[PDB]
Amino acid sequence: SRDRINVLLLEGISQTAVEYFKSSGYTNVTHLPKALDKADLIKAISSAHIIGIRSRTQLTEEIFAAANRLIAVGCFSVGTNQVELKAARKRGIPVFNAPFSNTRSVAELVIGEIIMLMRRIFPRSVSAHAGGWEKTAIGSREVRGKTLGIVGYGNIGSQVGNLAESLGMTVRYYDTSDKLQYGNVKPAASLDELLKTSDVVSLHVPSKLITEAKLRKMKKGAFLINNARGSDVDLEALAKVLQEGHLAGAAIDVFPVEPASNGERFSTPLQGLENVILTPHIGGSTEEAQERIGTEVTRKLVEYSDVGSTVGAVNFPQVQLPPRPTGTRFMHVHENRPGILNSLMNVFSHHHINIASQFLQTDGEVGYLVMEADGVGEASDAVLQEIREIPGTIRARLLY
Amino acid sequence: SRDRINVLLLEGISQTAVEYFKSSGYTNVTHLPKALDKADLIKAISSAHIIGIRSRTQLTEEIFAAANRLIAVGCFSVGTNQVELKAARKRGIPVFNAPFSNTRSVAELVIGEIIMLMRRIFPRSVSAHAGGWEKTAIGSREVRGKTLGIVGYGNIGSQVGNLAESLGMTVRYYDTSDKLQYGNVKPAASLDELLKTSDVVSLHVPSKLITEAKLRKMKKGAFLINNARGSDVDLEALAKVLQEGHLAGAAIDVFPVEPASNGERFSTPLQGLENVILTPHIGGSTEEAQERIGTEVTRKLVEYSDVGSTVGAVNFPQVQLPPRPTGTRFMHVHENRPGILNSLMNVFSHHHINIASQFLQTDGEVGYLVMEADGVGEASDAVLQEIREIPGTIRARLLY
Amino acid sequence: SRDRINVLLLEGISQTAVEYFKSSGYTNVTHLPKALDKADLIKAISSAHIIGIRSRTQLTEEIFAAANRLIAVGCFSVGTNQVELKAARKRGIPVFNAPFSNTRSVAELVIGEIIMLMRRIFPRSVSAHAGGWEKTAIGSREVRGKTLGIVGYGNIGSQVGNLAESLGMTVRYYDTSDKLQYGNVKPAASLDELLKTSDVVSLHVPSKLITEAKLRKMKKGAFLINNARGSDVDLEALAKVLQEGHLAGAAIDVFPVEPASNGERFSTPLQGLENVILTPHIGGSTEEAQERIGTEVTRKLVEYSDVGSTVGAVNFPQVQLPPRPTGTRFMHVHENRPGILNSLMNVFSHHHINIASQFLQTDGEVGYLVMEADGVGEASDAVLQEIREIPGTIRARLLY
Amino acid sequence: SRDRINVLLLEGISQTAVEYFKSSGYTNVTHLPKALDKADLIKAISSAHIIGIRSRTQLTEEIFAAANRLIAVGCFSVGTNQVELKAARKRGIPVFNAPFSNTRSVAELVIGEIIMLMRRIFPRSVSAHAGGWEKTAIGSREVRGKTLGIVGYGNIGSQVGNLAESLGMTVRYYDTSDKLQYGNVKPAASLDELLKTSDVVSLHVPSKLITEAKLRKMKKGAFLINNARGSDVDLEALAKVLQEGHLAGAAIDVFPVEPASNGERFSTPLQGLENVILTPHIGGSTEEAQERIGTEVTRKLVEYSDVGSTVGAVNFPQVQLPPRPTGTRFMHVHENRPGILNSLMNVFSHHHINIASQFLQTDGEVGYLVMEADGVGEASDAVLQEIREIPGTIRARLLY
């Protein structure tokens, strides 16, 4: 029964998550609008099977030590810096995030920013609020006909490309593991070739690439956007080439050092520069991304709890195995002790239970084995109890 | 010979204009990068047949009085407030502008601004430059799935609609003289219906529509963009509903009162408000629009000078008449004296010249007649000289 | 009153025409599902002001001689070969057709045929009906990636291009009066260049271009489609190059000689050839084109009857003149007698009526003058009666 | 060394396959343009590691018995009816086909056929070749504005939908495991709802659904296309409803009984019916699909031979396991003897070799295990030799 699985959701996680749990039979859901202090968290997590958090709840070894029943963590966000990932792994707890939910929010932002930057709209508006009047066409340009260079052509890169094309831009990309043409979108032979031949360069590197040398290769009057990785651009070098008037503008969402909360001062050498849009790491922060995150992370948690899939876990060996309509399914998390597979297989033989399929994956800390078997009822319970006792076992359970 | 037609171009008009004149046989082109003072202008215009200006050159009756040979004025811009239009008309001088060149520049701006406003990017960037850090999804939204309401569905309106659709917006329009559906773009039954059901309203009224009453009909959290007419919105009422937090943001390119140059202070009650983009009437100001203006206005001037077409003139009866490969073509500008048509026809009979087609259009000040006739050589010269002498005649010439 | 204007519609003209007349105030509509014989036609047309026909009704001088009141003919079809156009003109009767209604029907047909031809579907289906089984990929190809060459880039040509692009074709065009690029659609420098570099050539020449020499310039394995003009291709030469296997297929909707009705034998040297689609001049024949024709031709007839516009008439000088909300509007059709303009102007002066605008156009048979004037009531009636009496006058009327 | 792997390619497999093998280091390629007889096949396959065939080569148990070294079969085609799939499986030989290569060829065909059918082009062309002339708009329609109902919304279904939308059709789909909306493409609630509300129904069921009852639910004048599964439509019932004139046409590529080659008579009750396109199972038969098949199937074969992946094999447990840059990778195919996993694990322990990951999948005939291990050199050779000797082993090898 899934109504016995205690789901605890913190920090005002979207209602799309609560609904997804319910429709999956996970009706035992405690949903809070706030973060908890260490003490309330220790109390509340004490009986939790599944916890969902956002950016404020800190999940450390000390918390896991109190979490007697916890099987999985959902980070209802892109990042996972609030969870001790290795501590969770060593306790056989996968942590899931929402890596693709933000895609559309980042892509729209890039496209809007390309227009604002090529038109110099931000300095014009700052000036207008102050009483200035900068009515002039010089240095102001249409995006139609211009070349966008995209560095990293994954999910976001290609959505950015799609939208840029509908705006009449010529789109090129550089990506170390793709050279295919996509309709009118062509690969550049190299990063440098892309930099030299683009009017706007937007960084979309998958989770310094752009040094002063790279910036000086860009066309005079060109623009840089980085809404992807905070350590990818030398921002001191960017400030210099902007002040020289080599580059005409930039938009930057991510920084080498970002405030540890909205209640501490932000500093960057781009501050005070003309035609620079600075955004507080909000590329993925929309109401609609929050909704998609609620669904994405809950889907992962439901699938983990039902059938032990860990594909997409950020801290765990990635295992997926087609479920079967008969027999029983087991998972076993262990230390990587030599010969533990033998012990596991031996337990199954001993109980006359045949394994129909299995998937083992391992990393430096744990091995994770999921198995489909033909045992049923009490014979399966007995194999479970015995595999739990093999030395090096971290946890094991029966699955649907 | 067209190389005898003195073309004078002022204020750094795009080189696309100079080239268009040349390729048309108009090789006699004086091109200046600057505006002229009253005195230099009087001197330089004294022998000009065609003058092209931008925003700084003032063309008044006093100037036309000095312009012995002037047949046409090109305003290499959207507006025409620098030319005394009626004074030009009364002297039989059409003035041509570039009414459609700006279209793409306005449409791109609207689309970029919709994204910046729905995401609250401008206040976030102002805050970031000052050291603030506003990392939050609340009130921040994707444009995909949202409804854009377009008021005025002409050239710009429909381009705005095209681009908004490619960004996944649902697009509706209100226009008093169109109710047709265009693919997925549907008409609203009324202005109020459009206002009530849009997330963003963008004004594109062809050359106050939005009062406090209209603003209060808009959805709480909605956005207004006006990049079209400066007197269409009550900006004091807009400031109020923004401060109340009824509307979440606005972008405004045009104002009831705008500085008489970049060297005088701009004032608006929107100044200092959060999530308001203020732009100094630059909706049409791009390098690419300047290029298109150079071509558009030169095409009009060339066609006027060659065959007397005045369709598109902003101050003149609109006449167009298919040219014929034989005989002679005449134009005659006159005061609207009763019976002047009789006198004109009588002159033609007297010289045994038959009119094959003609188009007369008139307004409060002038009549403009273009005629195709079968006269040739000296017989045509004689009809010209005589029609020039009819009382009330302002000017007449032979055409190609 | 428009309910006094007798509209007679023949041959089952779409109901969209009847509705358009009604909504325009033209309520006096006799609508028949059939063609009439000479005798019934003479009787029925005797009091008709406006007649609409399709392909079977023959309108000759003899019929017009019986048509005491007829002002206009609507050919509710693309062609106009059933009307004596010159006879109508000489009686001051414009004839209007539906030149653009067919556009979409032709464009869809071309695109479907390109696929059938490149895949050799028609010979495969003929073979399958007869019990043959030609399962083979040889000579069978996808249209994606292929080059369509379009000869004549007007209305149909560009719609054909749009659709072909959505199917992943590269589209080029040759047109003697256009060299502009449209997005990804590029002009060829010449007809021969287009022929040599296309996989499929489709003819869309506006109302022999393709000789054996042209066919032999096409790529081996290429395809020709002619759904435009019946005399544009040497079909005997096409049959030869098809039998040689130089061209791989063709689709042809139009022929140098076509049966004078569906009740007479059709002959062409393409008959019996493999991978040739022969269609009986149905490129424009759809239920939806019939509907659009009903609207298009009725719009022309309504506008002619209301305000005398003849733009789009196939047999008449093309005149359009903006209507004014005051005074009176006149039209006058005449023989081209020298000095008739003088007589007309003199009549107007005599009655102290001032002409505010006018448009005269003429051809070899008639002059057509439309005039806006400031007369009202009985003064206008008197000018009408007198201009009707000027020698050479064919007809005249007051307009709205 | 891969140049030691004997690749034998038969029946004129596209050159894209030969190139893909070469670039992968598989240089030992014998490529024939023809099928082989039993005797030549037995000889040629005797030393083959990998064989590629098309539709004529028959691979039976008798052939496999002669194939001492064969590890994999490539069916360079969609179907696999020429290979004894179970016989191959029992010998531990996966068979790979090209399930997605045909997608574009099927989608284009459907779209062309929709146009031909709605326009009744095929009967018109049959008639024209015979001298008939059927110039008429009745029953002839544009596809723009019409509803396409798609049954099965997988790969082909959605490409069909994309293309149909670009042609201005409204597209709906019924699929038992999808209810999501895709842009403007909406799911129907049921098969019957889709049938009742479509103008054209196209079947794209993944590898009788449409009975007389279903056909009679379709709109009078509607069209059916089946280019997917040969047993999905009652063709006798289709012939009846066509003859009654309930349905206006059909296109059918696949039949309950199809000739065993191009040299035997084809029979179907649709033969001789008007507006029925019959195609000899060529929906996937293009030159471009043949090229894509060459690449697709070779990619599968290369990946199987290098790292033992069997995802996409049509006759084999589906196994994929991320490769590691160190240690050794093993595969083992066996009979499903209880306790064989224990024996395998025991062999590895005995040689002190640790397994880092593994994936077992099984079906009714075989178990297939792929393993990543930390053995190297001679220790790995010794484990290989010993696991080959476990009773029930079909084959085992080392991998890259």
TrEMBL record, chains A, B, C, D:
What are the ACT domain coordinates in residue numbering?
329-400
**NAD: present as a keyword of the record?**
yes
Enzymatic reactions: (R)-2-hydroxyglutarate + NAD(+) = 2-oxoglutarate + NADH + H(+); (2R)-3-phosphoglycerate + NAD(+) = 3-phosphooxypyruvate + NADH + H(+)
Q: Briefly, what is this protein's role? A: Catalyzes the reversible oxidation of 3-phospho-D-glycerate to 3-phosphonooxypyruvate, the first step of the phosphorylated L-serine biosynthesis pathway. Also catalyzes the reversible oxidation of 2-hydroxyglutarate to 2-oxoglutarate.
* Keywords assigned by UniProt, alphabetized: NAD, Oxidoreductase
Superkingdom to which the source organism belongs? Bacteria
What is the name attached to this protein's record?
D-3-phosphoglycerate dehydrogenase
Listed Pfam families: 2-Hacid_dh, 2-Hacid_dh_C, ACT_AHAS_ss
GO molecular function terms listed in the Swiss-Prot or TrEMBL record: (S)-2-hydroxyglutarate dehydrogenase activity; NAD binding; phosphoglycerate dehydrogenase activity
Give the record's family classification: Belongs to the D-isomer specific 2-hydroxyacid dehydrogenase family.
Q: What is its EC number?
A: 1.1.1.399, 1.1.1.95
What are its GO biological-process terms? L-serine biosynthetic process
- Does the keyword Oxidoreductase belong to this entry? yes
Query: InterPro entries under this entry?
Result: ACT-like_dom_sf, ACT_dom, AHAS_small-like_ACT, D-iso_2-hydroxyacid_DH_PdxB, D-isomer_2_OHA_DH_cat_dom, D-isomer_DH_CS, D-isomer_DH_CS1, D-isomer_DH_NAD-bd
Its top-level enzyme class, in one word, is oxidoreductase
Q: In which pathway does it act?
A: Amino-acid biosynthesis; L-serine biosynthesis; L-serine from 3-phospho-D-glycerate: step 1/3
